[PDB]
């Protein structure tokens, strides 16, 4: 088994394996970034609605107050 | 010739080692960044909640003041 | 939940990163072997061709010694 | 700034992943070359030695026919 034949043999193997690893890695990180993204928006919605309640109560406060005066 | 191989492997590990340390360091920092951003969002959520029930007890009291009043 | 998801992903990364670190640590070690064994056979073939080069070399040094002593 | 902190990290990753890919391709490409050089030089040393042995064998053949023709 020639070293030049052994060296080239490794080069085909590397080039192929390295090509497979990249593909898998890219898809993996895609999925993870996806999970986090979903969780982020989920957290975003919560903060969004929580703020709604607050400003909604604030509206009610100055709504009743707007009626306490004429009272 | 084996002096070429011995040279290569020692170069590989010296780099492979440096690569793992720099990578592990990199991920931990990114995880740190994200962790902080999340906590800040949690704090932000926890706060908007406290400021919601706060506003709620107020209207409960005001609507009571409006009722009893005439 | 971002915090809960971050922890999840963080664990998955540490999970695979260790596995992969081995599928490569072993692979790169099995390959440096093929080249290392090939280089040894190669270094041998030379040490064999060189010794042949000096094995036939001396043979000439004798046939000459016979041709002259007979002519 | 959730979606932002996530996007920043995704960009940093994609950026780092690129440089990691181009530094790897170089490193391996050169290390392979180096090994090819050594396997080539050695290879030549073999052919040079083989042609040398075969050269002498030619002599040993005809030089013997002279030991015969004479004797
Ligand atoms: Ca390419
Ligand atoms: Ca990540
Ligand atoms: Ca950094
Ligand atoms: Ca920072
Ligand atoms: Ca306040
Ligand atoms: Ca905005
Ligand atoms: Sm009052
Ligand atoms: Sm180790
Ligand atoms: Sm670097």
Swiss-Prot record, chain A:
Q: Which residues carry this modification: N6-succinyllysine?
A: 32
- PTM field: One of the most prominent phosphoproteins in various cells of mesenchymal origin. Phosphorylation is enhanced during cell division, at which time vimentin filaments are significantly reorganized. Phosphorylation by PKN1 inhibits the formation of filaments. Phosphorylated by STK33. Phosphorylated on tyrosine residues by SRMS.
State its location(s): Cytoplasm; Cytoplasm, Cytoskeleton; Nucleus matrix; Cell membrane
The annotated crosslink position for Glycyl lysine isopeptide (Lys-Gly) (interchain with G-Cter in SUMO2) is 32, 51
Q: Which residues carry this modification: N6-acetyllysine?
A: 32
TM helices/strands, residue ranges: none
Report the residues modified as Phosphoserine: 37, 63
Q: What induces or represses this gene?
A: Up-regulated by muramyl-dipeptide and lipopolysaccharide.
In which tissues does this protein get expressed?
Highly expressed in fibroblasts, some expression in T- and B-lymphocytes, and little or no expression in Burkitt's lymphoma cell lines. Expressed in many hormone-independent mammary carcinoma cell lines.
> Motif [IL]-x-C-x-x-[DE] motif: where?
64-67
| Pathological condition linked to this protein in its record | Cataract 30, multiple types: An opacification of the crystalline lens of the eye that frequently results in visual impairment or blindness. Opacities vary in morphology, are often confined to a portion of the lens, and may be static or progressive. In general, the more posteriorly located and dense an opacity, the greater the impact on visual function.
Q: Which family does it belong to?
A: Belongs to the intermediate filament family.
The domain comment in this protein's record states:
The central alpha-helical coiled-coil IF rod domain mediates elementary homodimerization. The [IL]-x-C-x-x-[DE] motif is a proposed target motif for cysteine S-nitrosylation mediated by the iNOS-S100A8/A9 transnitrosylase complex.
Q: What is the protein name for this chain?
A: Vimentin
Taxonomy of the source species: Eukaryota, Metazoa, Chordata, Craniata, Vertebrata
Portion held of the full protein: 263 to 333 of 466
From Swiss-Prot, chain B:
| Residues carrying Phosphoserine | 35, 61
Q: What is the superkingdom listed in this entry's lineage?
A: Eukaryota
Q: Which residues carry this modification: N6-acetyllysine?
A: 30
Q: Where is this cross-link: Glycyl lysine isopeptide (Lys-Gly) (interchain with G-Cter in SUMO2)?
A: 30, 49
Report what the Swiss-Prot or TrEMBL entry states about this protein's PTMs.
One of the most prominent phosphoproteins in various cells of mesenchymal origin. Phosphorylation is enhanced during cell division, at which time vimentin filaments are significantly reorganized. Phosphorylation by PKN1 inhibits the formation of filaments. Phosphorylated by STK33. Phosphorylated on tyrosine residues by SRMS. O-glycosylated during cytokinesis at sites identical or close to phosphorylation sites, this interferes with the phosphorylation status.
Residues that the record marks as modified (N6-succinyllysine) are 30
- What inducers act on this gene? Up-regulated by muramyl-dipeptide and lipopolysaccharide.
Q: Where is this motif: [IL]-x-C-x-x-[DE] motif?
A: 62-65
User: Where are the disulfide bridges?
Assistant: none
Q: Where is this protein localized, as stated in its record?
A: Cytoplasm; Cytoplasm, Cytoskeleton; Nucleus matrix; Cell membrane
Q: In which tissues is it expressed?
A: Highly expressed in fibroblasts, some expression in T- and B-lymphocytes, and little or no expression in Burkitt's lymphoma cell lines. Expressed in many hormone-independent mammary carcinoma cell lines.
Q: What is known of its domains?
A: The central alpha-helical coiled-coil IF rod domain mediates elementary homodimerization.
Quaternary structure and interacting proteins, as annotated: Homomer assembled from elementary dimers. Identified in complexes that contain VIM, EZR, AHNAK, BFSP1, BFSP2, ANK2, PLEC, PRX and spectrin. Interacts with BCAS3. Interacts with LGSN. Interacts with SYNM. Interacts (via rod region) with PLEC (via CH 1 domain). Interacts with PLEC isoform 1C. Interacts with STK33. Interacts with LARP6. Interacts with RAB8B. Interacts with TOR1A; the interaction associates TOR1A with the cytoskeleton. Interacts with TOR1AIP1. Interacts with DIAPH1. Interacts with EPPK1; interaction is dependent of higher-order structure of intermediate filament. (Microbial infection) Interacts with HCV core protein.
Q: Which family does it belong to?
A: Belongs to the intermediate filament family.
Report what the protein is called: Vimentin
Gene it is expressed from = VIM
Parent-protein residues present:
265 to 334 of 466
UniProtKB/Swiss-Prot annotation, chains C, D:
Where is it located? Cytoplasm; Cytoplasm, Cytoskeleton; Nucleus matrix; Cell membrane
Question: How does the record describe the protein's post-translational processing?
Answer: One of the most prominent phosphoproteins in various cells of mesenchymal origin. Phosphorylation is enhanced during cell division, at which time vimentin filaments are significantly reorganized. Phosphorylation by PKN1 inhibits the formation of filaments. Phosphorylated by STK33. Phosphorylated on tyrosine residues by SRMS. O-glycosylated during cytokinesis at sites identical or close to phosphorylation sites, this interferes with the phosphorylation status.
Domain notes per entry? The central alpha-helical coiled-coil IF rod domain mediates elementary homodimerization.
N6-acetyllysine: residues bearing it: 31
Signal peptide location:
none
The protein depicted here goes by the name Vimentin
Q: Which residues carry this modification: Phosphoserine?
A: 36, 62
Disease annotation reads: Cataract 30, multiple types: An opacification of the crystalline lens of the eye that frequently results in visual impairment or blindness. Opacities vary in morphology, are often confined to a portion of the lens, and may be static or progressive. In general, the more posteriorly located and dense an opacity, the greater the impact on visual function.
Q: Which organism is it from?
A: Homo sapiens
Cross-link annotation Glycyl lysine isopeptide (Lys-Gly) (interchain with G-Cter in SUMO2), location: 31, 50
Q: Which residues carry this modification: N6-succinyllysine?
A: 31
Per the entry, what this protein does is: Vimentins are class-III intermediate filaments found in various non-epithelial cells, especially mesenchymal cells. Vimentin is attached to the nucleus, endoplasmic reticulum, and mitochondria, either laterally or terminally. Plays a role in cell directional movement, orientation, cell sheet organization and Golgi complex polarization at the cell migration front. Protects SCRIB from proteasomal degradation and facilitates its localization to intermediate filaments in a cell contact-mediated manner.
Description of what induces expression? Up-regulated by muramyl-dipeptide and lipopolysaccharide.
Q: List where the motif [IL]-x-C-x-x-[DE] motif lies.
A: 63-66
Similarity comment: family membership: Belongs to the intermediate filament family.
């Amino acid at each position: 088994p020639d070293l030049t034949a052994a060296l080239r043999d490794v080069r085909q193997q590397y080039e192929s394996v390295a090509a497979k690893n990249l593909q898998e890695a890219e898809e993996w990180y895609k999925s993870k970034f996806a999970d986090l993204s979903e969780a982020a928006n989920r957290n975003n919605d919560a903060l969004r609605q929580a703020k709604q309640e607050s400003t909604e109560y604030r509206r009610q406060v100055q709504s009743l107050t707007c009626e306490v005066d004429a009272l």
